[PDB]
Amino acid sequence: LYFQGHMEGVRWAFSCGTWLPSRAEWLLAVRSIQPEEKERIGQFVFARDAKAAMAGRLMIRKLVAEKLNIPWNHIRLQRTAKGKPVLAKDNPYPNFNFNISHQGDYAVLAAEPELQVGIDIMKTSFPGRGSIPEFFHIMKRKFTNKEWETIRSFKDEWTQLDMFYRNWALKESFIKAIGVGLGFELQRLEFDLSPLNLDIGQVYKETRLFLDGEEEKEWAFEESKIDEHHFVAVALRKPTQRQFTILNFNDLMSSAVPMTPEDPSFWDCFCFTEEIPIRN
Ligand SMILES: CC(C)(COP(=O)(O)OP(=O)(O)OC[C@H]1O[C@@H](n2cnc3c(N)ncnc32)[C@H](O)[C@@H]1OP(=O)(O)O)[C@@H](O)C(=O)NCCC(=O)NCCS
Ligand SMILES: [Cl-]
Ligand SMILES: [Mg+2]
């Protein structure tokens, strides 16, 4: 009917872990977000967390600005009672919605014009305390009997770890899609992971979810490895390229404009993990 573009699904990542902005670039970014979000970021103790959260905000603003054609300074983002970022009530889309996650060295965003969307990123890391088996026993309540049988079916304990983190990202993607936050009973959610082995450079779409013991055929999941050690899961509730495009700071700043005045307190106020021994 109209001479107009139609939004497709968006899959974007940003390497916040290797982002090293100058001071002017950091402070410009701080100016380009909402005041209450800026306040929230100014209270993180560590730089890597401030950087991750900043990246998430800028990705969400670039999304709305460029896919909904709303001036950056006119984007009004809100949060549900359970913390979930949402776009304030009226674009022309049936169910425009978006979700981010930030873990290890990356921020990731998924968005969709109609499908309800959730995302999680997890990095495989050896346990901070105790053996792998002790970790699995501490974490027992998060996964069902059948999910544990799959996780523990590999001979290699590290492969079991990968599989643990993959199943975690999958469940958290579902939970984030529906916005319930904390307290969802994880025993209710049973994923049947397929295929068993994932390589870099493909999106995989065969995993299925059973909720309260019945297959939820209206939900689909996309799984990929952004690198050898980071797993991403997108959950979607009812010509497609679904690989994540990795953006840089310049791309985050493409439609950005300052919204608050420059704030020098936001420079030189964070700790860095390089200053301490990583333990736990
Ligand atoms: C926020 C939550 C969903 C996950 O926290 P997390 O893993 O530390 O955070 P992630 O980086 O993956 O995602 C955080 C982002 O989600 C968004 N978010 C916040 N609340 C949300 C909610 N209730 N629903 C969906 N997204 C939400 C925010 O944009 C947040 O980024 P920000 O803090 O920079 O604003 C938290 O509610 C939670 O841990 N509950 C689920 C626990 C769970 O069941 N885990 C799976 C175990 S197998
Ligand atoms: Cl913001
Ligand atoms: Mg998470």
Numbering used by the authors: 18 to 107, 110 to 257, 274 to 315
List sentences quoted exactly from the publication behind this structure.
The posttranslational modification of a conserved serine residue in carrier proteins with a phosphopantetheinyl moiety transferred from coenzyme A through the enzyme phosphopantetheinyl transferase (PPT) is vital to all living organisms. Molecular cloning and biochemical characterization of human PPT revealed that this cytosolic enzyme is a Mg2+-requiring monomeric enzyme that exhibits a broad acceptor substrate specificity. Whereas microbial genomes contain more than one PPT, only one PPT has been identified in mammals. This enzyme exhibits a broad substrate specificity and is able to phosphopantetheinylate the ACP components of the cytosolic and the mitochondrial FAS systems, as well as aminoadipate semialdehyde dehydrogenase, the human ortholog to the yeast lys5 gene. Human phosphopantetheinyl transferase exhibits an α/β fold and 2-fold pseudosymmetry similar to the Sfp phosphopantetheinyl transferase from Bacillus subtilis.
CoA is bound in a bent conformation with the pyrophosphate group at the apex of the bend, and clear density is observed for all parts of the molecule including the phosphopantheteinyl moiety. The 3-phospho-adenosine portion of CoA is tightly bound through a combination of hydrophobic and hydrogen-bonding interactions contributed by residues Lys89, Lys91, Asn108, Arg47, and Arg86. The latter two basic residues play a key role by forming salt bridges to the oxygen atoms of the 3′-phosphate of the adenine ribose. In addition, the Nɛ2 nitrogen of the imidazole side chain of His111 binds to the 3′-phosphate group. The α-phosphate group of the pyrophosphate moiety is held in place by interactions with the main-chain amide of His111 and the side-chain hydroxyl of Ser110, while the phosphopantheteinyl group is bound through interactions with side and main chains of residues Glu181, Gly190, Leu191, and Leu195. Magnesium is coordinated by the α and β groups of the CoA pyrophosphate, the carboxylates of Asp129 and Glu181, and one water molecule. A sixth ligand for the Mg is not present in the final crystallographic model; however, there is some residual density that implies this position may be occupied by a poorly ordered water molecule. The metal cation is found in a solvent inaccessible area, shielded by protein and CoA moieties. As found in many other Mg binding proteins, PPT has, besides the inner coordination sphere of the ligands described above, a hydrophobic outer shell that is provided by residues Ile130, Met131, Tyr174, and Trp177, thus creating an environment of high hydrophobic contrast. In the PPT-CoA complex, the long C-terminal coil of the enzyme (residues 290–305) is highly ordered due to its participation in crystal packing with two other subunits in the crystal lattice.
